[PDB]
Amino acid sequence: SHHWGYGKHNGPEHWHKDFPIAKGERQSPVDIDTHTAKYDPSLKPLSVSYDQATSLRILNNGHAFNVEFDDSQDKAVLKGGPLDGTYRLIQFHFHWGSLDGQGSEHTVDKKKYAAELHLVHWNTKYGDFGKAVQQPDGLAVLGIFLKVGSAKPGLQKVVDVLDSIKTKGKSADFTNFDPRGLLPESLDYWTYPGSLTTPPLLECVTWIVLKEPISVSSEQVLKFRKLNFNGEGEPEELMVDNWRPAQPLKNRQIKASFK
Numbered sequence: 001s002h003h004w005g006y007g008k009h010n011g012p013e014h015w016h017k018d019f020p021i022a023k024g025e026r027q028s029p030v031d032i033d034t035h036t037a038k039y040d041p042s043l044k045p046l047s048v049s050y051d052q053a054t055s056l057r058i059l060n061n062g063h064a065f066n067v068e069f070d071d072s073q074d075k076a077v078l079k080g081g082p083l084d085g086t087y088r089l090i091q092f093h094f095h096w097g098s099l100d101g102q103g104s105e106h107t108v109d110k111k112k113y114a115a116e117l118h119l120v121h122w123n124t125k126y127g128d129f130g131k132a133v134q135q136p137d138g139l140a141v142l143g144i145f146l147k148v149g150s151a152k153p154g155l156q157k158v159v160d161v162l163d164s165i166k167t168k169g170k171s172a173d174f175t176n177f178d179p180r181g182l183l184p185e186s187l188d189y190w191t192y193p194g195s196l197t198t199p200p201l202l203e204c205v206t207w208i209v210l211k212e213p214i215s216v217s218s219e220q221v222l223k224f225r226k227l228n229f230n231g232e233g234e235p236e237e238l239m240v241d242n243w244r245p246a247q248p249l250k251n252r253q254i255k256a257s258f259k
């Protein structure tokens with residue numbers, strides 16, 4: 001059974017023993033060297049179309065919390081940019097730190113942000129998420145950095161439900177949540193081919209990482225850090241530092257949408 005996590009004994013340094021692709025050619029996250037990334041004029045405009053998004057539920061899966069969406073139709077899709085065709089939103093989640101100086105998976109010139117939001121989408125040409133993760137162009141993950149400063153009003157509904165999903169396996173109704181309230185003003189981005197950042201580490205992701213971070217309050221991120229990795233009735237282990245460090249870039253080019 002799966003026993004990977006983020007501890008000294010089951011963390012990122014151990015994952016390769018059960019998931020050998022951990023040492024593969026297109027692993028994520030990476031450090032984004034802003035001076036080596038090249039502006040690509042061939043990139044088409046990015047289209048985030050979340051007007052008809054239908055959120056369903058929020059789940060503590062023991063690694064993060066996921067806000068799940070209805071992906072049975074083209075209700076909330078990502079198109080354009082580096083992408084061919086239509087990618088449907090299935091879930092979002094975050095990665096965060098024990099302190100504000102760490103938490104993000106991607107880094108920018110080695111800078112770590114307090115957290116990183118992942119909006120996960122699958123390519124509709126493969127029919128379902130499970131088929132899409134088997135394909136090199138199966139997923140598109142929109143990554144958004146979080147810095148600590150002013151509160152993000154569009155995050156507060158998420159923060160306020162977390163005490164109902166404290167432990168692994170707990171879920172709560174989470175209808176009528178608008179993920180557009182989690183975006184920054186600018187859609188300027190970097191893109192590169194990579195992987196899932198947790199086991200099974202499948203090399204199926206087109207990464208689109210926004211340049212502009214969102215600001216969240218210290219009080220908002222403190223509520224993320226009150227979650228637990230453990231199940232109810234197990235010793236309490238705070239859900240903090242659920243991020244994989246930067247992996248080798250190898251033979252990849254990061255492309256910028258902006259000058």
Ligand SMILES: NS(=O)(=O)c1ccc(OC[C@@H](O)C[Te]C[C@@H](O)COc2ccc(S(N)(=O)=O)cc2)cc1
Nearest residue numbers: 118120129130133134141195196197198199200202
């Ligand atoms: N035979 S094989 O092709 O090698 C193969 C091996 C394992 C397979 O397991 C498929 C299952 O879907 C488990 Te992949 C869904 C799981 O919910 C994780 O999803 C994530 C979503 C986003 C991110 S992130 N942080 O990068 O945004 C991270 C994880 C399927 C095929």
Ligand SMILES: [Zn+2]
Nearest residue numbers: 093095118197
């Ligand atoms: Zn993630």
